[PDB]
Design a protein around this ligand. Structure first.
Ligand code: HEM
Ligand code: HEM
Ligand code: HEM
Ligand code: HEM
Ligand SMILES: O[C@H](C[C@H]1c2ccccc2-c2cncn21)C1CCCCC1
Ligand SMILES: O[C@H](C[C@H]1c2ccccc2-c2cncn21)C1CCCCC1
Ligand SMILES: O[C@H](C[C@H]1c2ccccc2-c2cncn21)C1CCCCC1
Ligand SMILES: O[C@H](C[C@H]1c2ccccc2-c2cncn21)C1CCCCC1
Ligand SMILES: C[C@](N)(Cc1c[nH]c2ccccc12)C(=O)O
Ligand SMILES: C[C@](N)(Cc1c[nH]c2ccccc12)C(=O)O
Ligand SMILES: C[C@](N)(Cc1c[nH]c2ccccc12)C(=O)O
Ligand SMILES: C[C@](N)(Cc1c[nH]c2ccccc12)C(=O)O
Lengths: 334, 341, 343, 323
């Protein structure tokens, strides 16, 4: 009674799950089989991503992430989620071998089933941390229950936020990253202005003054906590002010041994956001090719990027020399 | 009301994941990826079988005789290669699993094997892999009951190789009464080889010249061996070739006159059959490299990455018999109009 | 003896890498990646223009009229889409450069601009992006980024026949449109009038259920969509507003190929229409990947102009895509009799 | 003011395309594809050499000893992997050239050879493909000089070897990894119709690890490449990858295997490409072998995988030494 391949993979279920509605209603359409397998393969891969993402969530929730031995496992699993998403984006290439005209021969047999009825796609969006401030009454029972759990349980965004708030170096009576960054950027701007004013009155000099004033407003706006809370409340920002500070600390001090793998995490979170919006864009394109002129387009935006704040740290890049120096004491803490 | 989950029978697809590591109270995280990865391969093997069997059926029932159906044949065979190309990239997901982590659940797999993939064997058999082509360690002893019944059917029913062969034997232009391609081709290669021997013999005695002589003499042996039907039967018997002499003629006719309207899509079909063989071999290669990365030290698998498992090896080997454009027999207005839709 | 390096002119290609950061005394490692990446895109843009110009010529010199040339036209157009697929994947190399590292050398690039890619503009023009339909960046015409010989080539590329115009002309001559022959358009209008009446009658026989109420609104929209197809005045209006590109007769040609693609003479022509949509869709994906790249490097107008290029405006063969709108059940399609089946 | 075309020296890059078929008054369309494809490979080979040299130099000049440099080292080796992946995919473009169309211009290529790609040889050498396991007649002048430098200057393999030898945990008077590992395996192998056969061959595999003389013999054959102490370093990083100081080192070892795999995948696609165009030179089939895998020792550590319970447990004092 040894283990057999087919039994191990429950192929008696996986390979007996293919029912063409076109056939069930006496008008078998060959390409319907493709439509079915493609969706079943997406849903297996959605199940794998939920498996990886729930395991990473738990490592944050149960405090194991506090032990930095576990940062390799956390980054390898998040990196794995992006490798799967890359395959899922490539996988539209298969459904592009189906013409609009052959889709047209079986689409009537699909009504009224909706993509909005993909539980796992909703679970994945909620568990990464997509805003509810955007419906979703398409579910009932055990399914409607899993959705509610996914809505109330801590999102990856919330768990990363809490961990970013504990980033070493933010302590005002320690390294005091924020205090020193505000000072160096202020002095840096004052120096850059004096350099600029010393010049003769060229139109070049006017385009420099105007560039300086733009730079000054953007960089100093980083230190406006009221502005951050206002933008948080409008949904344009997602991380707490202190989590923003921790992310920037990891960005600027990425080479410090304790920050190396955390920097790979932040990168991988941005990759997952990029690949999800590539998924949504290839899908929008697929729908247009099939139905022509005839909400999905609205989902291809920064509104749906959970880690929008990680992207927007590029806005606040400063000359390398303005970054507060690490002395031997804080070099060795890191 | 038809519902997404019900339409796709997700109550089966998403309730088919059972970790043996967990079953035996030592749940290993990466076993889940091992299961999903294979299940995804097996969904796509089923889709390939669906395309492939539909194309076999279009040859078998004679609908292929009506050239309206060539676009459908080429789209479905191209679709098979687009699927296989994703299946080759899909290994990159299993590469995110280290040897160390695989080693933690590996023992719970024994003794289930890849040889027990029914669909992989159905797919090999239906393209046209013969028992004689296969290396042992016999493949059918891994199966029983209705699975053993389906495999037998896969060996006994007409393969894509056989159905393509029958269709290539009927390629217009081969008829000795008509365009008489083979006769004109032998004439023009014999004539072209004579003109070439003459150009070379004209050159001043130099090491370069003697290098061109020996190059010509081997080229002359290769090109003229094309017309040796009994050399062809000998290569059939050793398994170095698979297509009938007449099928080989039909292939080479489509190859040289590809731009003639009636041959445009048939040329794309010959191209897709090579693609399918290349991508099956690339699958075999990535699978071998995957096993090496996970186990270190298998020799059977390395054997499978060779022309012995390429069903349409003859279509690759037509490149061997490339000649100068001007040697290709010219077409008169009557044979031009016969190759027009 | 011809040598590999001499044949490939590697003495030019591999001596064209000058880091501006090094030239001004502060060598930044990653600028070398920035340079190779662009040089690789520009070689491939040259290859695309070589394929594209060869196909334009085949239409322009009348060789396309001999249907034996269709395999060459479709292989070269398929080749263009295979290159564009690689160019889309090539962003993944430049994604290994972090915003912090790009920031160390961006100052040395000023004021060089992607707007100054001559090959990218030639490519857009030759496919058939019209200058009067371009979004202006910084309130200016794209051609004022260029002077002298380059400005002149761009003008030739705008004035010379575009791939859209040549395909348009070829589509106008599609067999089956002749009113005194198969009379495609006439038979299509009649079959759609009929199918619609038959569909109305099936629906009005279904109580007054909310499902029936829905099918009535849905029927009403499809009827307006399908019968607007036959309104040639509405088409000329949309042609002038640039919301369409193909002549009314070209649209008929395309829909003739779409519906009768399995007919032997239409099989490779259908592959050409597919490949033109592929090129549009892959140029849009390039524009999309470039936009995402600009965001990753600079954060959050220039970010908005690039977003404006990821739209149906810049899809030269948008009409081929929009034929999906005019899909009808297979049995409404005019049947082919033995006379036109054989032609 | 700086211009895009001048910054990129397009006046050189886009004026380097000479069809030999055209030069001899029989212009063959597909020859342009053949030239651009090779030019793109060579731009990318140049980028790989730039990355690979910067990494070699970080080892050679001692900066790798400062562990803050490990992110930079793994980023750039990962970048090499990503480029090599594009180059494997890039064969897809030359696959749009039929054998027949190649046949129309291949005569005008003779006698230029692939063996004359300088950068490809520079690349193989700098990584550390050994000469005794294999080309240089095909070059003269400055090119022949650069090839000698690339054979004589320290390879990536040599620099990685040196660095692996200093891997903390090997010191006999410290954690004594090798000592404790030999102990635990032998004690673990203590064990109680059947298939007792597997146990025996298994025992021989595991214990052959501790045969330093076997290793030196295989080292001289070129069937192994890493010094015995390098192999101890490597295995330490493998078993203790989670330890903070080993996490990025483990990524680097993975990247080095990735590069071997992708170079072989390039060799394999190239071999298929030759077979597609010329039919049935296949010396190239020999190059698709572990003989040409510089980091074969890193791949082979999978053979010496043991039950976790046997891996020497780590005490707090060494846990703290590995941060
Ligand atoms: C022929 C191909 C496709 C067409 C025509 C299509 C059509 C649509 C349409 C019209 C919607 C909007 C809601 C609705 O009417 O149901 C939608 C949403 C959706 N589709 Fe598809 N779809 C296609 C392929 C796919 C595939 C391959 C997947 C794979 C899982 C998928 C997953 C979804 C999901 C998850 C949604 C909800 C999207 C969101 O909320 O942002 N679709 N699709
Ligand atoms: C960790 C990854 C993998 C390992 C270690 C592995 C190992 C092996 C081994 C040892 C064999 C020889 C027969 C046996 O004992 O089972 C084999 C054959 C096979 N494996 Fe895998 N395999 C892996 C991944 C895959 C995947 C993802 C597939 C996808 C379906 C697959 C499909 C097969 C097939 C069909 C065979 C039979 C192939 C033939 O006869 O030519 N393997 N594999
Ligand atoms: C770090 C990567 C990149 C950044 C930050 C970047 C940035 C920009 C920006 C700001 C513009 C608009 C204004 C301007 O012309 O300066 C632009 C346009 C453009 N870039 Fe890039 N770019 C990047 C990579 C690339 C690459 C790899 C290519 C390859 C050819 C490219 C080609 C172009 C082209 C052709 C335009 C004009 C686009 C149009 O009119 O639609 N860029 N880019
Ligand atoms: C139609 C495509 C190709 C054919 C027929 C071809 C043919 C060959 C042949 C016959 C050799 C053996 C040496 C010789 O006789 O010159 C070779 C080696 C080589 N080819 Fe190609 N080749 C092709 C494409 C490419 C491409 C795209 C590259 C990209 C740079 C390339 C790079 C090389 C290199 C570097 C070698 C030396 C390889 C080694 O020692 O392992 N080839 N090729
Ligand atoms: O949106 C559904 C299709 C629906 C669906 C049904 C069954 C399985 C998967 C999917 C799916 C995925 N995205 C949309 N859908 C209709 C809506 C009208 C245009 C044709 C498709
Ligand atoms: O090779 C099989 C694993 C086997 C298998 C079992 C269950 C599900 C899928 C697979 C599979 C795929 N290729 C090989 N196998 C054994 C033999 C020793 C090495 C790995 C475990
Ligand atoms: O647009 C240029 C860069 C420009 C360029 C210069 C040289 C080589 C390639 C490129 C390129 C590609 N896309 C935009 N650019 C600036 C504009 C300001 C932000 C930093 C990028
Ligand atoms: O191998 C060379 C071609 C050679 C070459 C010449 C010019 C530019 C690039 C290349 C190349 C790449 N791989 C092999 N070659 C010949 C050898 C005889 C058969 C046809 C190809
Ligand atoms: C002990 C700690 N791991 C510290 C910590 C928090 N966030 C970080 C980000 C980067 C590096 C370290 C940290 C923890 O509190 O989880
Ligand atoms: C009538 C025919 N379709 C002729 C035929 C056979 N093989 C071909 C290959 C290419 C082109 C045509 C054919 C048939 O016999 O099927
Ligand atoms: C004789 C012709 N080759 C006819 C033609 C025009 N457009 C077409 C589209 C599909 C098929 C044929 C045509 C010509 O006039 O070019
Ligand atoms: C001080 C040290 N960086 C130690 C070292 C050597 N090899 C390693 C591998 C992994 C981790 C650390 C090391 C050095 O000597 O380089």
């Amino acid at each position: 009674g040894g283990l057999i391949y087919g039994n191990y993979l429950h192929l008696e279920k996986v390979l007996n799950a293919q029912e063409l509605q076109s056939e069930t209603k006496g008008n078998k359409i060959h390409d319907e089989h493709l439509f079915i397998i493609t969706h079943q393969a997406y849903e297996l891969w959605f199940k794998q991503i939920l498996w990886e993402l729930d395991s990473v969530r738990e490592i944050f929730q149960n405090g194991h992430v506090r032990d930095e031995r576990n940062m390799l496992k956390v980054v390898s699993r998040m990196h794995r989620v992006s490798v799967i998403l890359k395959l899922l984006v490539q996988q539209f290439s298969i459904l592009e071998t189906m013409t609009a005209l052959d889709f047209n021969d079986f689409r009537e047999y699909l009504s009224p089933a909706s993509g909005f009825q993909s539980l796992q796609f909703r679970l994945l969006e909620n568990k990464i941390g997509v805003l509810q401030n955007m419906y979703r009454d398409n579910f009932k029972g055990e399914e409607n229950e899993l959705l509610l759990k996914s809505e109330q349980e801590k999102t990856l965004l919330e768990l990363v936020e809490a961990w970013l708030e504990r980033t070493p170096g933010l302590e005002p009576h320690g390294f005091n990253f924020w205090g020193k960054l505000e000072k160096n950027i202020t002095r840096g701007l004052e120096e850059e202005f004096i350099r600029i004013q010393a010049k003769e009155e060229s139109e070049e000099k006017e385009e420099q003054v105007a560039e300086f004033q733009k730079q000054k407003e953007v960089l100093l706006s980083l230190f406006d906590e009221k502005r951050h809370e206002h933008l948080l409340s409008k949904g344009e920002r997602r991380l707490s002010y202190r989590a923003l500070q921790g992310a920037l600390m990891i960005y600027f001090y990425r080479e410090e041994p304790r920050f190396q793998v955390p920097f790979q995490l932040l990168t991988s979170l941005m990759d997952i956001d990029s690949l999800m919006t590539k998924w949504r864009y290839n899908h929008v394109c697929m729908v247009h090719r099939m139905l022509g002129s005839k909400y999905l387009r609205s989902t291809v935006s920064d509104r749906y990027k959970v880690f929008v704040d990680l992207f927007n740290l590029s806005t606040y890049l400063i000359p390398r020399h303005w970054i507060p120096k690490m002395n031997p004491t804080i070099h060795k803490f890191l």
